[PDB]
Design a protein around this ligand. Sequence first.
Ligand SMILES: *[C@H](c1ccc(Br)cc1)[C@H]1SC(=S)N(NS(=O)(=O)c2ccccc2)C1=O
Length: 557
Amino acid sequence: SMSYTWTGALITPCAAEESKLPINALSNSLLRHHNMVYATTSRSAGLRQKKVTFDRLQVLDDHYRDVLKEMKAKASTVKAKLLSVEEACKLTPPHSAKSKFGYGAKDVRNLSSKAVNHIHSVWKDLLEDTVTPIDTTIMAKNEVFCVQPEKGGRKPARLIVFPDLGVRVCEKMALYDVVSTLPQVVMGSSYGFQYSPGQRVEFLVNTWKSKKNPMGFSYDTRCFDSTVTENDIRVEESIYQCCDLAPEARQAIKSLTERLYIGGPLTNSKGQNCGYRRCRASGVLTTSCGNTLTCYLKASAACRAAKLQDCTMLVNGDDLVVICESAGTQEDAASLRVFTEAMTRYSAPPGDPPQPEYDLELITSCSSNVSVAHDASGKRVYYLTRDPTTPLARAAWETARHTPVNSWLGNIIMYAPTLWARMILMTHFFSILLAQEQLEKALDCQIYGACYSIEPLDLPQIIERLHGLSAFSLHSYSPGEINRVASCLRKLGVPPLRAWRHRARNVRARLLSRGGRAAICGKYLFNWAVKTKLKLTPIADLSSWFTAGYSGGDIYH
Ligand SMILES: *[C@H](c1ccc(Br)cc1)[C@H]1SC(=S)N(NS(=O)(=O)c2ccccc2)C1=O
């Protein structure tokens, strides 16, 4: 069926939309080519609609059924429970989109009588009606990027589809525990959200070394959400139903699946009917879990169809990487086309066709790649990195304009061992925090889709816990990594690394002259900036951060 059907009504904005990076002294000192940084807006929604709208002609085979069978067997061993209205309300982000029935995220978190009553009535409607399509709002996402001349154009805005706040609270009650525990059980080590960046690198390296003649590849599905069929979503529901669940959950899950997940009417911000959706909604609680399960199911089946030897996959939503035994270059090339053919039959054709890679560092998955550096003793240390273009463009944007989400802080946390996060992001932001006396100001940042409130002075502790002490001592980075960073800086007009060193020395001294954690930040985060290095001893439970994915799931921790 068609992923979407449009009426003609436009996807409209609910507020003023900034698209250009304003000229600001603070952001200018980080990146000069401001004209290269932009934010997508509803003005390009039409271009995105055209791409995400198409007919899916899914054909399933024995490989697919066999894998599905094994997945259900593992799901049957999982026991999940309903969340109380209180527990679901507590997971609601402080600034989540307010309901259209006269109450908001604030009312929900505070458990206002009006919020709790509407929630109760929505829940009861789910149990009493498992057919009537639930309404959803379609909006254009505003995200920041850097222009890519070679691409031939700017990126169109992504579309987000989400139901009313009351429905979202009910999703949590019926499914938060399921999406939070089921995937790792069904997928095992292949479930990518159970890993911190370091654990991810460890799994990738160990897996790579476990092959006699390693070969790996990432598979990029073109418009994954749109390729997800009504059958995929119902198969996904059957996997959830294999769990040990309370009658109410079972009923609410069937209802949400039939009324929301498999499709429904699309309404713009003006209240007009934009059309109908018959694919995955980007903005529901099950998006990440459903996508991961679906990608895994299809990729696993396609691995068997292609007869790939000793395969090992790592899946994060639609992000997929496969490492296996090579059979020669020509044979690997033929095997990948077979893999692609199967994925296509399963309704998941490629954006870019997959390419066999024989060097681990050259495999980009989930926009990242493993690279190597050395600690103080000269020992090899593998770590996760990525091209810094987007992180830098977003850092500049967030420096000029106050934003609810601080992607720069998530980037420092996730890519703390990288030379770019250390020399540029840490330096630039601590300099600003010092200037504004906001070192103790807590900030919101997304990690695996979930929202966390983090204090920047806690960075040293967070980084040590997540990456170990080596994150503060890495040096002698690879030639490839060094060149990518250097190239990115010239393109964006970002000052050279040597200039950042000078800035860091100044920032470092200022933090050391201050109290508590500020001195620890100066000592640990900027030890790389001084020749006479201090002794980095262990600093005198972030497990919940890397347990499951929640992208588009309206989760606040
Ligand atoms: C790809 C991804 C990148 C790094 C890792 Br360790 C896992 C997966 C996608 S999946 C996802 S959700 N995110 N957002 S994140 O919150 O994991 C994040 C934020 C900032 C830097 C890196 C990762 C991805 O990036």
